[PDB]
Amino acid sequence: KSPEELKGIFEKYAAKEGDPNQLSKEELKLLLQTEFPSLLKGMSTLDELFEELDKAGDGEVSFEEFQVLVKKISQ
């Protein structure tokens, strides 16, 4: 369930940036705020989090990179 749900979520957020398969920092943030209010801890952390998370993509988090985030969320 969770993988599919999170893929759906991910895709729906991504689509807002036109690119149906990728989350820019703001999209990643926005999604994390809405879906996971506390995971971000404090806004600034997005820098570190995104830097770590988006290892390959750098600019935009693909579902590949996002699954690294999922491995943290655990659900």
Describe the structure.
- This protein is mainly alpha-helical and 75 residues long.
- The protein has a single domain, classed as EF-hand (Recoverin, domain 1), CATH 1.10.238.10.
- It has 4 helices and 2 strands; from the N terminus they run H-E-H-H-E-H.
- The protein has a two-stranded antiparallel ribbon.
- Ca(2+) 1 binds at residues 22, 27.
- This is Protein S100-G.
- The modification Phosphoserine is found at residue 38.
- One of its GO terms (molecular function) is calcium ion binding.
Give structural attributes.
75 residues; mainly alpha; two-stranded antiparallel ribbon; 4 helices
In short:
This protein has 75 residues and is mainly α. It has helices spanning 2-16, 25-35, 46-53, 63-73; strands at residues 22-24, 60-62. The chain has a two-stranded antiparallel ribbon with strand order 1-2.
Q: Can you tell me the overall shape?
A: globular
Report the CATH C-level class. Mainly Alpha
Percentage of residues in DSSP E strands: 5-15%
* Overall tally of domains: 1
The helix/strand order is HEHHEH
Distance between the termini: 10 Å
In DSSP terms (H or I, runs of 4 or more residues), the helix count works out at: 4
Largest sheet: 2 strands, antiparallel
List the strand order in the largest sheet: 1-2
Q: Please count the beta strands (DSSP E, at least 2 residues each).
A: 2
The CATH superfamily turns out to be: EF-hand
CATH fold-level name: Recoverin, domain 1
CATH architecture: Orthogonal Bundle
Radius of gyration: 11 Å
Helix percent reads: 55-70%
**Structural class estimated from helices and strands:** mainly alpha
PDB class: signaling protein
Keywords: EF-hand, calcium-binding protein
Assembly: monomeric
Entry title: cooperativity in EF-hand CA2+-binding proteins: evidence of site-site communication from binding-induced changes in structure and dynamics of N56A calbindin D9K
